[PDB]
Amino acid sequence: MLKTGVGVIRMWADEGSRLSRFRMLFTSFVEPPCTSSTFFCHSNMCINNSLVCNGVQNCAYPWDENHCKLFEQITKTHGTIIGVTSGIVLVLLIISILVQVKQPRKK
Amino acid sequence: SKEASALGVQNIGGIFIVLAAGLVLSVFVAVGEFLYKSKKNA
Amino acid sequence: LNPLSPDIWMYVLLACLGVSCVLFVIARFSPYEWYNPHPCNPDSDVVENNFTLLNSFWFGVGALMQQGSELMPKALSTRIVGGIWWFFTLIIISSYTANLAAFLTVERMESPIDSADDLAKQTKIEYGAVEDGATMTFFKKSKISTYDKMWAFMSSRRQSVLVKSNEEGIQRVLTSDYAFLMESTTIEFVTQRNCNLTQIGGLIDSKGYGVGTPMGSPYRDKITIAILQLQEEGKLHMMKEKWWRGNGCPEEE
Amino acid sequence: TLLNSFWFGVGALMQQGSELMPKALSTRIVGGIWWFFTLIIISSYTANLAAFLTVERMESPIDSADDLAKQTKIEYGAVEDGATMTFFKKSKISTYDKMWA
Amino acid sequence: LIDSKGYGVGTPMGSPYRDKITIAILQLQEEGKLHMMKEKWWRGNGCPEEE
Amino acid sequence: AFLTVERMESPIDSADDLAKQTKIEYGAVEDGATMTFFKKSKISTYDKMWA
Secondary structure, eight states, rough: OOSSSSSOOOOOOOOOTTOOOOOOOOOOOOOOOOOSSOOOSSTTTTSSSOOOTTTSSOSSSSSSSOOOOOOTTOOOOHHHHHHHHHHHHHHHHHHHHHHHHHSSOOO | OOOOOOBOOOOOOHHHHHHHHHHHHHHHHHHHHHHHHHHHHH | TTBBOOHHHHHHHHHHHHHHHHHHHHHSOOSSSSSSTTTSSSOOOOOBBOOOOHHHHHHEEEHHHHHHOOOOSSSHHHHHHHHHHHHHHHHHHHHHHHHHHHHHHHHHHHOOOOOOHHHHHHHSSSSSTTSSSSSHHHHHHHHHHHHHHHHHHHHHTTTTTSSSHHHHHHHHHHSOOOOOOOHHHHHHHTTTTTTOOOOOOOOOSSSOOOOOSSSSSSSHHHHHHHHHHHHHHTTHHHIIIIIIISSEEEEEO | OHHHHHHHHHHTTTTTTOOOOSHHHHHHHHHHHHHHHHHHHHHHHHHHHHHHTTTOOOOOOOOOOOHHHHOOOOOOOTTTTTTHHHHTTTOOOHHHHHHHH | OOOOOOOOOOOOOTTTTHHHHHHHHHHHHTTTTTHHHHHHHOOOOOOOOOO | OOOHHHSSOOOOHHHHHHHOOOOOOOOOOOOOOSHHHHHHHHHHHHHHHHH
């Protein structure tokens, strides 16, 4: 946590240019308590200008970009396929059946 | 204790297969008997 | 509907309908079903089958229902297809009841947590506390195997779940699962300041609320005897009422 | 009739069926829907009873002092001259008085 | 629980071991062997299999 | 009920199975260093079965 508002990050290498990685993130507005424009993630960590659900672990703990929240029966791997084909078979069979429903009689 | 498992075709497919087999045998024996009766009558 | 996946149901219905069409095309196109009508029939000549679309469809339904039917299929073809149909039905409904038995019993036999060790054997519901709030520190110095492994798990998480603020962890528990080990007193206060929150287990630790006095203190024994009186009167139980029980019984829903 | 339709409903709830079967389509809707509900029911019942018969979570009627302080079919107890009787003597408090008396 | 009472050690007024034993009891509770020995001499066979 | 109890129950395969379990009884050639090992064992499971 930076106490001030201006950051200073220096890195030293000594023919170790392959030092695996220094990959880190800085967060603004860590300073203010809540106002509507901003968003609470931790104690006095209301920060939001736009980082509400920014797809990055944008706060100390997952609170900001973090768990913000009849077509499914259509989307089957092949159950939808053979199911609708079976429905087609059904329809054709019904077409056939109504004939002998209406056409024939006794002897 | 995790076995909150809705049964799916992956555990029940066999009855449909038996169903198709029965349907084909039905067609077979039905046409066989109909033509058998037709030939016997003549 | 739960024991069966929301696909077979549709498979069930479509199979019923297709079977029914098969049945009727078997019956009205058959060399046998055609029948002499009269109860005392001297070889009449108005014979016919006895199946409709309506009849065969409902028969298929009813056999799928385990409630019989009205048509008595007669010939080889109709009887064999009906046999397969009956097999389909019995196996499906049997399997259904088995699965529902499965859910209800696997439910009933679950044991919701009720003790700290039981929590330790748990894995999904996480542990932790307000960091270093003298609470996890006891775990740090803990010698009990349950608490030893509890601290081992907390060291595994190691700020993965170690909330900084009591209320922040309160929200954590409200929105998810958590253990959130912390002092009893505030727990009963909060629980009877709210709902959804329960005391679980006993007093894992034991601490006391005394009165601080310097080494030189004549008032020590005097105030101790005073509080012994107030306790033996139950009067301090009464004042507990005042501050918790009085404001800790607005919320029994 | 009313008599036989009633008899059909009751005998159909249980799995036997009646032979006043629906001759017409309209009445067959009722017959089918009724069959569905009853099968739901009987299977559900068998499942749930299987659920109890093999888990048998025993239950205690009483879980707090006030709880049996309000019923009367269970007798309390204490040692004579037991300090239990002394603290419960001079109950001083909400409910322990009824029990002491 | 309904009441709240504790058990102490027999000592007359002002005996020299008084605060010396208060601090010892506090420490022993802190290391928790109070719990361990209480469990050990109150353990018994434990609950068998009620399954 | 019978079938689910039967399939549910489990044949033992571990020492701690015996540790928790109480119906069946252990066995050891006493003084063959076996029971000496158990009594010298400080492992809570072997400790409790030894006791």
